[PDB]
Symmetry: D2
Subunit: 232 residues, 4 copies
Amino acid sequence: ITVKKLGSRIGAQIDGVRLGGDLDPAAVNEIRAALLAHKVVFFRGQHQLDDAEQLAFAGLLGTPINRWHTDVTFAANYPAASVLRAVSLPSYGGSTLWANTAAAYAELPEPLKCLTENLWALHTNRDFRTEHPVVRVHPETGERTLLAGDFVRSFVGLDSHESRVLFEVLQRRITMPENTIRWNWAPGDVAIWDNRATQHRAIDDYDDQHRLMHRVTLMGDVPVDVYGQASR
Amino acid sequence: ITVKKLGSRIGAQIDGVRLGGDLDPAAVNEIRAALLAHKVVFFRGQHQLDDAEQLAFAGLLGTPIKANRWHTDVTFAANYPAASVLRAVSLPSYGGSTLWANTAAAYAELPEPLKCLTENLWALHTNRTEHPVVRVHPETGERTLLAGDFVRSFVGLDSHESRVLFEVLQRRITMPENTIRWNWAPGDVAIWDNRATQHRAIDDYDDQHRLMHRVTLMGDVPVDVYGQASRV
Amino acid sequence: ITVKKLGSRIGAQIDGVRLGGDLDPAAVNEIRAALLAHKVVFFRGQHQLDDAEQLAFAGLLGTPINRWHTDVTFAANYPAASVLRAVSLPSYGGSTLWANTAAAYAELPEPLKCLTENLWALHTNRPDFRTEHPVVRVHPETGERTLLAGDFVRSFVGLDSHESRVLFEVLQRRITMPENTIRWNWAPGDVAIWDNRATQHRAIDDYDDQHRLMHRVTLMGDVPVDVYGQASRVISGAPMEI
Amino acid sequence: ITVKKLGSRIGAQIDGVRLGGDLDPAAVNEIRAALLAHKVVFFRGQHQLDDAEQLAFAGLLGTPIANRWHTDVTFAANYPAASVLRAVSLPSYGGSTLWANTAAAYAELPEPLKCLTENLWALHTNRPDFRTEHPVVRVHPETGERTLLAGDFVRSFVGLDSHESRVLFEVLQRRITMPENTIRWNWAPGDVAIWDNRATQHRAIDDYDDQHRLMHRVTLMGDVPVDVYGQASRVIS
Ligand SMILES: O=C(O)CNC(=O)C(=O)O
Ligand SMILES: O=C(O)CNC(=O)C(=O)O
Ligand SMILES: O=C(O)CNC(=O)C(=O)O
Ligand SMILES: O=C(O)CNC(=O)C(=O)O
Ligand code: NI
Ligand code: NI
Ligand code: NI
Ligand code: NI
């Protein structure tokens, strides 16, 4: 099971793997290890995956159930990761972006660290309304990762202007091209992204063409800040 | 001799042509027509090209005259170049992709208030030349935005206003739906209409050396909607 | 009769005028003249002026009905002017700010004029008033073009949240710039009258939790029109009456 | 000596004292106690002040050495502590001056913004090429209060890029210069303002057209700022 690097801070393709229920435990752990490090991983030539087969593979990794976002952060226990498969693609366009929120935190100056560490945001669908920290400690890897995205409505104890301004400041660093991967989809492609340490965005640049994408989301946990305080 | 669409607002790939001086006038008309329409065009497997053959080809288009920040080339100069012919000589093992943006579509998709603004707005480009923010393209006749990283300020506006407005325009230009991100492979050639485009390198390949052979053409002096030339 | 200027772009004090309901017609014109030119005018030592007398005086100018704002712009026919009298003031602080929106427009770069002339804003209270106003309205009397924004603004039509707030703050910065504002320190028995169709105003909460009371009388206004001559659109709620 | 308050966060007027070099220690201690507390203090009815008499009174406070919000000469490391400004020739109208309380500004920062500012450093320049790196928060030598340090001289913040510098700068300046945290003095003849430059910003207002305006100032010697952790400012040039 080889793992080719795609970008400096994010992205890695994986070859010599046939996804499915019949997978070797050691093979699954290497995928899990590659996922945590590279934040998003890709598998090409997976034309054997139907809905039932993709569900089986997701069962090994975890537990099954446009604008820059982390999936369903308005919820308290937002999902850990997702497995997305291309089934029907447009003849042009329809790529997807991913950002590394772990490297986003790491490359902050110390003042912006002090800021984000003690800053809390209100995530909502704009009626679920969760209060998340802007920096969560990743339970598995132990990395500190920024938590924001389009669901963010405001920051706690902070006015509209300051919330809006700081939000875009943080988003500017997260989405900065050097910290992102843009995947050109093809038939039989499968993406897996760690939702605890990523942000993603669909690109609506295929006009009025159809584009079906069968996703399988895994079960998530409640974030905690550097001090160890849960969301509310 | 076909040309296929890559994105809704930008990007095309021209397959079925060997780039060189031998190409007939009809072939150049296909390339030019695609280039003006699609703003950036790409060729695949141009292994025959070197420096001499590429320079000979570039001469058919016009007269041959870090970059990790959204820019139009040499806009600090008055008669900045029309288009460029960039070729992959040697690439990194991973990353080293390039972004493109359609500044013609950007203008066309402006609300009328912002059209009012940009048509009448002027920017100071430097590393000192006053360009208009909207210029009329001398072939297609399309109004296209002219900004980028070389802009220090806007004429009539102060530091705050200049920046705040500058961000607003660049947010629309560099919007992902208005961009193509090329993954360079050996023997790839990209040609972009520097008049009607904006581009950006991505330093997502650590300390790996990336050599790119560019041939930039002769360009004309901008004029705004009123036909006013760029002062110096 | 005397009209002392306070600032370059806004503000004027008017002495030798006892405000009342039996004021001379020519004296009302002198006041109205200054109010149009100086946008806000001030009167001192008006101890006799009670509530009953204030309403009578207000009836001469027109028809009787904290963050930078123009009063009740969530409504379509928002007031033309107001008459604020000081009845109870704190021991310190509690001043009020005014901004000249006619001069604000006048001193826009041509690009920002181009923008604002064609720009429209949604004003709302959150009762459920929602009104689309032109950002630049033509003043009926003076014929001057004046910026119409303020706290009641919610979004600009056609633009997204980021652009709206960005451009909103750019305009508000020019409107509320110190060189374009007056700051009145209230003394007992003072009166302020402002042209609401060519001003924004702001209370300053810099007197802690203290008592501050001032009775107001608001004059009925008209529905704004842009430079093209297009009336403001009403989404929800009715116009103001009486 | 009576000392009336002007605003809740800033400003105070002091009556019952004629400014001069022959003031009793007790009197000057009250004037300073007022200055420290209220940031800026005003002395009306001082039509008798000569330049020499102004310099005399200034010598009791310390050692004798523009239409944008600034702290005087923050491009220098040991920038002035306070100044005593006097009106000599005023316009027919306008010409007021603004003052902000940068001590109260810091205090009212949410916990996140304290984190930011406490660890943030700025480059102050004169655009002579005095270039200094100050902390965005300094501990005041006398009061012990933490005050925001910025103004027009700030070229950028250390660690942050151009966009982030400007954005965050403007966020701070908005909080500092918020009307609730400001005092706007209407200059009358024979008025004297005294502001604590270590705990304030100020701004001239060009709202007197092109009229003649003359102001005579006596600035006092100040110390080098030190952040919460206790690190002095660095002279780059
Ligand atoms: O790739 C895409 O189209 C984006 N997918 C998602 O946002 C998602 O699965 O939540
Ligand atoms: O392709 C790249 O890396 C960017 N090229 C340029 O900015 C250029 O040729 O001017
Ligand atoms: O003067 C003040 O304190 C503010 N008054 C108003 O906003 C008003 O009357 O609408
Ligand atoms: O009083 C003014 O207009 C401004 N004064 C100063 O900026 C100063 O004394 O440093
Ligand atoms: Ni998603
Ligand atoms: Ni370039
Ligand atoms: Ni009001
Ligand atoms: Ni000064």
